[PDB]
Amino acid sequence: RPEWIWLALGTALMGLGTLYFLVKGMGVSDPDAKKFYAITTLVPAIAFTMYLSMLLGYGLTMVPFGGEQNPIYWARYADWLFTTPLLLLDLALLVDADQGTILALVGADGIMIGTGLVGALTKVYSYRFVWWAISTAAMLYILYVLFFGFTSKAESMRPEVASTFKVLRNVTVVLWSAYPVVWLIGSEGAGIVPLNIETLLFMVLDVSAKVGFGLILLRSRAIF
Ligand SMILES: CCCCCCCC(=O)Nc1c(I)c(C(=O)O)c(I)c(C(=O)O)c1I
Ligand SMILES: CCCCCCCC(=O)Nc1c(I)c(C(=O)O)c(I)c(C(=O)O)c1I
Ligand SMILES: *C/C=C(C)/C=C/C=C(C)/C=C/C1=C(C)CCCC1(C)C
Ligand SMILES: CCCCCCCCCCCCCCCC
Ligand SMILES: CCCCCCCCCCCC
Ligand SMILES: CCCCCCCCCCCC
Numbered sequence: 001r002p003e004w005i006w007l008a009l010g011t012a013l014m015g016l017g018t019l020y021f022l023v024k025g026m027g028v029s030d031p032d033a034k035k036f037y038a039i040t041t042l043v044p045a046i047a048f049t050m051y052l053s054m055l056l057g058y059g060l061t062m063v064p065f066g067g068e069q070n071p072i073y074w075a076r077y078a079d080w081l082f083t084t085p086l087l088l089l090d091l092a093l094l095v096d097a098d099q100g101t102i103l104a105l106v107g108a109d110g111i112m113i114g115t116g117l118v119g120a121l122t123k124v125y126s127y128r129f130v131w132w133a134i135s136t137a138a139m140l141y142i143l144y145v146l147f148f149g150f151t152s153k154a155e156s157m158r159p160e161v162a163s164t165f166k167v168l169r170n171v172t173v174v175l176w177s178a179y180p181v182v183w184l185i186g187s188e189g190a191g192i193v194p195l196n197i198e199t200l201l202f203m204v205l206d207v208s209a210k211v212g213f214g215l216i217l218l219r220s221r222a223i224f
């Protein structure tokens with residue numbers, strides 16, 4: 001498993017991210033700031049667990065398609081199922097989205113992760129991409145709401161909140177956009193990019209989307 005090295009680096013980075021966020025979060029009195037610490041510390045914690053699992057050889061299965069037996073890390077989806085809605089929740093609390101909007105985003109997010117997982121396990125090569133397409137559409141719905149809906153909500157907040165939302169929004173659009181592409185070209189889809197490089201890419205994306213995101217949010221005045 002040549003990809004072990006990037007599973008190890010991702011473990012170490014998620015672990016350090018979590019530790020740092022926990023230490024800083026434990027020293028914070030502001031009640032608002034605390035909620036953001038709690039949600040955000042959980043994100044790399046969950047990622048650390050799943051990265052550790054995969055490093056130790058769990059959450060990997062073989063799926064036949066295209067006449068080969070292909071290795072699929074399904075533990076990624078167990079991670080993303082819980083971490084992606086928590087990141088959305090961070091953004092929704094920053095802009096005070098309402099409840100129905102939160103429910104719509106969390107549900108689209110569930111569809112995105114669940115259909116992606118189904119696509120990753122599908123044995124008929126062609127139908128894999130049907131699932132991929134549905135998952136991507138759910139994703140684009142989320143991105144639309146974040147870009148159009150949340151930006152409008154953020155503009156009723158003080159500028160320092162609006163500014164922080166924008167940076168986090170822009171990070172999110174750019175980082176989340178790349179995931180369906182990686183999947184399409186990697187070992188789950190077209191099989192062009194081998195598993196090791198793909199594991200590197202998902203590791204860079206995961207650390208950036210979780211620890212990078214967290215560092216921006218948790219160091220800003222916006223959460224106090
Ligand atoms: C791989 C992730 C790359 C995406 C970069 C996101 C940070 C950002 O929004 N930068 C930025 C900032 I900070 C700022 C800023 O300084 O507030 C602004 I204004 C803008 C803009 O709209 O031009 C931008 I773009
Ligand atoms: C990808 C990880 C690297 C990001 C490190 C900078 C994070 C940051 O919040 N910077 C920052 C600055 I510089 C500044 C600044 O201009 O000093 C401010 I004000 C805020 C804020 O409170 O909104 C923030 I958040
Ligand atoms: C920490 C992880 C983050 C922010 C992960 C985000 C992951 C996605 C946006 C994944 C999206 C996918 C698609 C849109 C289609 C193909 C399947 C996925 C699950 C890779
Ligand atoms: C008539 C208003 C609805 C228009 C629907 C747009 C559908 C396609 C959007 C998919 C892409 C959203 C990208 C988000 C920008 C970051
Ligand atoms: C109180 C705010 C700081 C973070 C709270 C902990 C949230 C759960 C993460 C525990 C990981 C070990
Ligand atoms: C008013 C809120 C409606 C929620 C819409 C969920 C959209 C699901 C994504 C479509 C993927 C096929």
Ligand SMILES: CCCCCCCCCCCC
Nearest residue numbers: 137138140141144145148149
């Ligand atoms: C294929 C992706 C569908 C995106 C459709 C956007 C729905 C409008 C919601 C309004 C929120 C700003």
Ligand SMILES: CCCCCCCCCCCC
Nearest residue numbers: 182185192193194197198201
């Ligand atoms: C079989 C090993 C050689 C192929 C290397 C493919 C790397 C493509 C990376 C594209 C990055 C997005």
Ligand SMILES: CCCCCCCCCC
Nearest residue numbers: 007008009011012013055
């Ligand atoms: C063969 C070398 C094994 C080392 C494993 C270390 C991974 C943990 C992250 C620091």
Ligand SMILES: CCCCCCCCCC
Nearest residue numbers: 018019045048049052053
């Ligand atoms: C600070 C890190 C807390 C997470 C430890 C949980 C380990 C679960 C093993 C799968």
Ligand SMILES: CCCCCCCCCC
Nearest residue numbers: 178201204205208212213
């Ligand atoms: C496909 C790799 C995407 C590259 C962006 C990584 C930069 C992270 C800084 C927050």
Ligand SMILES: CCCCCCCCC
Nearest residue numbers: 016017020207208211212
């Ligand atoms: C001890 C700080 C850990 C943060 C990891 C940095 C990742 C930057 C993208």
Ligand SMILES: CCCCCCCCC
Nearest residue numbers: 115126127128130131134
């Ligand atoms: C969410 C609706 C599922 C439609 C899937 C069609 C299956 C084709 C293989």
Ligand SMILES: CCCCCCC
Nearest residue numbers: 016019020021023024
């Ligand atoms: C070890 C470097 C981390 C800086 C945070 C304050 C100790």
Ligand SMILES: CCCCCCC
Nearest residue numbers: 164167171212216220
């Ligand atoms: C990835 C860009 C970080 C900018 C932080 C400024 C608040």
